[PDB]
Amino acid sequence: TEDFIKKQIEEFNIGKRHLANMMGEDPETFTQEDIDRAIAYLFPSGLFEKRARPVMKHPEQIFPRQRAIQWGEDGRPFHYLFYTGKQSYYSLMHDVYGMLLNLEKHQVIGSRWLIKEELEEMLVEKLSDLDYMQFIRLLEKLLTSQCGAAEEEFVQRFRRSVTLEEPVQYDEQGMAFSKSEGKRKTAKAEAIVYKHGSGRIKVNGIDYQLYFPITQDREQLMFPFHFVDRLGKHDVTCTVSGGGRSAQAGAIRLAMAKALCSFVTEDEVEWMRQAGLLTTDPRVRERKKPGQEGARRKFTWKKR
Amino acid sequence: LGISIKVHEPPRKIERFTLLQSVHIYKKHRVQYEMRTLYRCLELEHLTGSTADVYLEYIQRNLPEGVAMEVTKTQLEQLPEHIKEPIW
Amino acid sequence: HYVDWRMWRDVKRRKMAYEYADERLRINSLRKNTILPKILQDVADEEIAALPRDSCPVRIRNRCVMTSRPRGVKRRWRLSRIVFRHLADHGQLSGIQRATW
Amino acid sequence: SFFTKLTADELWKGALAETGAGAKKGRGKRTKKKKRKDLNRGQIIGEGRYGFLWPGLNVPLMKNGAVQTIAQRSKEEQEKVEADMIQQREEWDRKKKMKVKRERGWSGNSWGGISLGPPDPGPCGETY
Amino acid sequence: VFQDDPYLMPASSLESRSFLLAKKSGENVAKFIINSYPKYFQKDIAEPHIPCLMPEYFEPQIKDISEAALKERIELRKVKASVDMFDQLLQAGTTVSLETTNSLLDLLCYYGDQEPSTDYHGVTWRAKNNAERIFSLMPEKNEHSYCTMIRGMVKHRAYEQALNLYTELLNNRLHADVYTFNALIEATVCAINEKFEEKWSKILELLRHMVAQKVKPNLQTFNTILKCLRRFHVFARSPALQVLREMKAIGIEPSLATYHHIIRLFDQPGDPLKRSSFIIYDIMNELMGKRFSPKDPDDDKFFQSAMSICSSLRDLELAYQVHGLLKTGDNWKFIGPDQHRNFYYSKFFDLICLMEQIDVTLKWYEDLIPSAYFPHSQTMIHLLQALDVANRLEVIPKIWKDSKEYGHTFRSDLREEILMLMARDKHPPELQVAFADCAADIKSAYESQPIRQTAQDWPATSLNCIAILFLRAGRTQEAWKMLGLFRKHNKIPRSELLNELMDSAKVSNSPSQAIEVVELASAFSLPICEGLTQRVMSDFAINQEQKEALSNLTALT
Amino acid sequence: RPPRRKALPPRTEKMAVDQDWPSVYPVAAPFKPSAVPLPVRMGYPVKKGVPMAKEGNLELLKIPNFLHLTPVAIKKHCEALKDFCTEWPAALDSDEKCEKHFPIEIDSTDYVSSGPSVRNPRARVVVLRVKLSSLNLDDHAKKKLIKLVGERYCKTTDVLTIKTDRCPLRRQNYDYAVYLLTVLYHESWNTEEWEKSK
Amino acid sequence: NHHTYAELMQTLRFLGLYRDEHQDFMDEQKRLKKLRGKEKPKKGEGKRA
Amino acid sequence: KNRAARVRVSKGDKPVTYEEAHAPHYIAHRKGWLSLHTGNLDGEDHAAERTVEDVFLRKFMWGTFPGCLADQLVLKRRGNQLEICAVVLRQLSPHKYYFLVGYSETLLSYFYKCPVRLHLQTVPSKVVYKYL
RNA sequence: GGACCUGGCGGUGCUUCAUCCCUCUAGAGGAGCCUGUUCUGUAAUCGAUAAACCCCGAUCAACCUCACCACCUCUUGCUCAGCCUAUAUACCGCCAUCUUCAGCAAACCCUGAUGAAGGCUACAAAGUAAGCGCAAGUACCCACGUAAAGACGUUAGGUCAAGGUGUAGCCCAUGAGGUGGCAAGAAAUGGGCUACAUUUUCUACCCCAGAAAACUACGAUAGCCCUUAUGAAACUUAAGGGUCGAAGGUGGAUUUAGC
Ligand SMILES: [Mg+2]
After folding, report:
1. What φ, ψ does residue F127 adopt, rounded to 5°?
2. Distance (Å) from the C-alpha of residue D105 to the closest C-alpha of chain H?
3. Which has the closest alpha carbon to H31: E356, F59, E73, E439?
4. Does the CB of G15 have a partner CB in chain E at under 8 Å?
5. Domain ranges in chain C?
6. Is there a contact between C2 and D1 if contact means CB atoms under 8 Å apart?
């Protein structure tokens, strides 16, 4: 209940003061981050679930935001859309519809739509898939319409940033170069590409033609420079370790491409990315499962 | 305590093993368990025997349960008299 | 008060092996070599054969220490697979967790 | 073996066969059946065959203002105590067995006319 | 030593003592089972070896009748086995040394042949005892042989026999040890009832005998001297000072026991300002800033007596000095057993409450209770009196809660004192509400008393105070309900209670309430009831029925 | 009917915000909810629920809490223990000077584990290390010593490493390492006739 | 040492300081069976002859 | 169907604590181990002895506090110390609790040759994490 | 007997699906051997045994293990006895199977006149707040994937031989101990290994080589012999060497696995 929440808030304030005393810091400037660090130090827990570790947050966060009963002592609900059972969702829809009406009166890249779980957390109300789809359609109709700054801010409450994903150094002799790293399977490589050179690659201190006898590995090495037409114009010193011949070739290729990105133009960097020369390959060996011959092959189902 | 100290984390070791699931037959069904061993190496440099003993006692008496410790001590020594000059 | 008579037999075998281990080691060292004369080695063979049968370490079986199960025993914990699973799945064994990777 | 023993709950679950296909189906007639009993109904901590009196556990810690010492009941009084425990268990079982009849409905094997008491009370001061 | 859990934290001194005794009983039971079944605990898996966790044996190994077997039984303190071994040795004629028989005499005389007490299996000197029998059977006797018997006789209060054996030793021209001298001092003092000067001369003569024998005395000598001279009090006061001066001159530094004995000697009903004040002040000046050490078995009772006189003299500064001396170094370990510690802290807190500012008094209350001890109802009453003197009644509710923590919930004296202090005066509505809540809690405690085996006893003053507090808080309905308790248990309602009830009724204009008050007062036949009746006609708008009832009740005047 | 004991309110209520925490927890002790004045919650919450409160929370009881090692407590403990420390020689500023003055390094290991038995065989191993450059040898003695030691000498690091593990105690292994170094040095400085067959 | 463990627990149960629930269940079943008529005969007295 | 250490839902009324509620695959994920000792770490030894000791301690404590235990024990080991942390219902008078604490501590200390401490936390009733 | 409801079924209609079929790769089905089962034999275990038995309980049998057999021995016995004696069709415990599922079960509410029964439409028309499962979260290298998880229920599914236990039975024996012993192929079948080679074989090397290449080829981890390792015990097990160079020449219907 509300009185319970008030008591929890008072207890949290007292506990915050006590924790500040315990860690020897100013209670007046003991932020939530300090509280979390102190709790993690005093009550260490290796449990992988972060929600299972000890927590002493504010009651506004520990307790669900569904709040106590939505009516006072008289029993009158606070919200006028309470009897809809989804007062948050329908209030939001009503506000969006009012915004659309006002837009009628007056007259993509780094963001995505929050998932249904995120919206449910926002409104602390359970919602159906079709309800979420209807709200998304309304929001997208709002966006497509000539939305103003206020509507853009309203949408940004639901926009979620998309997860889309170089230095130049000088040696002791003033040779401008770039250094980068790459991984492929188990092989790990570190490459150094100099700004000016005459196409000489030394792998582990050994020339590539003597270190990579297979023509395929040399072709993989040639791929980045040949893509940007810079064959024979750069000097590369790279060291690779682990894996086999092809894994090492791929790791060196990725490291060389990433390092060479420091010299080619931004459009050339984008072209290299679109060619796949910069994406770290996540294809790694899959573990063998018990009761099976291999990663995916089952044992021969016995003849019947 | 005025002791130079450095910290690093050696790579963990995850020992895994497999057991038959059912008490009888059903060989194709197993349960796999593991025992993760996480490490932390503290290197303390250039401290005397008394300070080393005090610090080791302090950190060992407070060692949390479930955490083992392996302290390696590099004892500086002088050449014995027999080795400073040849007896021959 | 052991789990079964087989566990009792194993305990007796272990005790006798511990009792006779020094003499068995000495006689085997007398045997497993080529330095000593052949007649002495044959006498040592006869003597070690004359020793009680249960003193031989090969007769010791690593049964489970709680259910006397003679197979599926993890040597590090000396428990059968069933008992080890029962204890590990209840969290009563330190640091042992289900392996998922 | 001590390590092979189990708890009372597990033993009751195993012996009573409360679960399983037999309970669900009942193909195997169980007129000769077992019922759960509380083995710890009347057991007092610190009471056993040897009849020892441990101060502070089963006998008063301080008697006549002085701390009692470890004392063992005589064989006669210990036998009397064991017999009294047996008789108390028998009395508890007898009281468990006794019950009270009810009033039949329209006929001795028909539910019609049998009263069910008042309806369950409502959530907020709404009783019947 | 207790468990830091709300359900297992002791809530009284009695509960504290009982919990500690129960824990010790559990430890004793465990030790008994360990000793009874050693084969279940012989598997030693500890590295390094831990001897104190191994089972202990109580069976002699040397079974053949020999001197080694006798010494083994003496070390094992098996009195019956030792006596049987000596008898068999004497009958068989096998060799025994003077030292072995001396050790046997030590074992027998120290216990006085009384069998030692284990977990399970006045002149206490028995007239029929084997110690004197073996001493007679002893062919060779030395200084130690006489000394052990004398010490055993004195320990068992066989003073006459000890003096006779000392006379025998003197005739044999042996030199008694200092312990024998102390035992003889005790025997000489306790043997006969004489004036102080006779015992004083006897003690000086024994000391001169020791000087002639060249034996140098110890702390135990003067300690026993003072302990035995404690009877004469005023007679031995100055001679005790002479003994202390002699101790200082010799260099035998007095310990806590010596000062405690001097304190007990100088303690007597009368005027402590005469000499006792000088004694305690000089002792405190001497001992200030000195760390003590275990020197005498009676060193633990010093602080108890010191705080007793501190309370008696009403010198809070002296008590503070004593407490500081206790806190310095490891002197706190000399506070003594649980009873002595409780008495010491009780007297200290009583003195603090009596003679200190209420702020420092509350600081001391927080510091000591419950960490130091659990207060008694009298100490709580003293604290309440100090608070009332300071007029800091706002703490009074908290104290009651503290009382509920310390088991004084059902203490009638404390409850009545709290109620009288709260209801004595009228206070702002916040304090009045706090007092009403405290009174309601006290009433609830009265309803839940464990003395609920017969018709409950309700103190009249307590009921009046609770009703007055409730009325002054505006909770008149509870007072109206409680008015029936007076009639039920014949407890006279207070005159001020009736006055306040009538005032509230007149302000609220409730003639029925005034009629009820007059009915109660007439049931109790108080004279004030007459005025109440008049007041009901004088201050209230009275209906015809109520007026007729008042006229009829007027005949009771 | 016998009275039923009522549990007291926890003493965290009587605590003060500016008290001395190390007094409450001087030593390592299990998490006591009645003694920790913090509203800590642990446990995976149920749906539309909150993490379990500390009272009865077995999860918090499982955690090896560091409430007895707060920074204030650590600072006070170090201040107390400063009396026990001895200053390291300020002259030996770097490992170069350490090798210059102390050319023999002895490595040993102490293993700490939970259990009633403290014995551990791996603690008996002693590793002596010395730079041949720091020794006093000529060309012939160095060459003979290298052949004598075999794999124990790494020419890259110029460090001779003698590992003693055959004696039951660490002190015995250290004595054996010193003796082995002594005899190796003396034989290195000793020249045999058959050495002419090189 | 199963001897040590079992004997110690049995002795504690006899002393009343250890409530062996499993042994209590076994004793209850034994009493019921003895009432039913199932009892061990004396040695050397096998029913089959 | 997996059956290990799981409490199967029957009617939605049976109460279970936090540990009983969670299935074995939640160990080290949502619930820690009930015994902490260095036996199972890399290179360490005497794991079997510690496991046997833990099993015996759990059985002994369950049989010594009949019905008092409100949850599983926590067996912590620091050096040669041995802390048994238990959660107990407030059934018995504290005299019996203190007697049992002293008894169990002394007996276990003499039986395992290590200083055994017993820390009890009392609860009014078995803590209910959820109903099944 | 009339009408209706639910289910089953229809050589029942329509619609849409999946690895159901074709398509892709490598296998099995032919040979030898390893191993498992079955059968025979023997004085000589048991259990699993359609998918969901068949390198299964076993992460393992020369003695031990061992529960089998023959012979001999013991009787308060290691146990306040014991039993691997019967019953998985009394059970706990741990699992298989659909599940490579998404639903389940309570507590209510409503409709049908308060009949059995039924309860969905998103521009929504009576369903629903909670619980369990999926999901989410977590482990591994990510947000992907793989693990893990996977309710209720189905097959009286498997296990009384992990252990515990109900009932029943044994107690000079269905208990306990000792010595010795099986374990062979006339076979059938399941899985696996090695092959039948030239994208191969041998050597060097770890991918720029030289030879071999059909009766002195390819092809045995088989047989025979001799060492060696372990062990008290080895023609038994394993490793190595020698010797032998066998069947076989890419294998039918059918069948397994993979994204
Ligand atoms: Mg009838």
Report:
1. -120, 110
2. 31
3. F59
4. yes
5. 1-91
6. yes
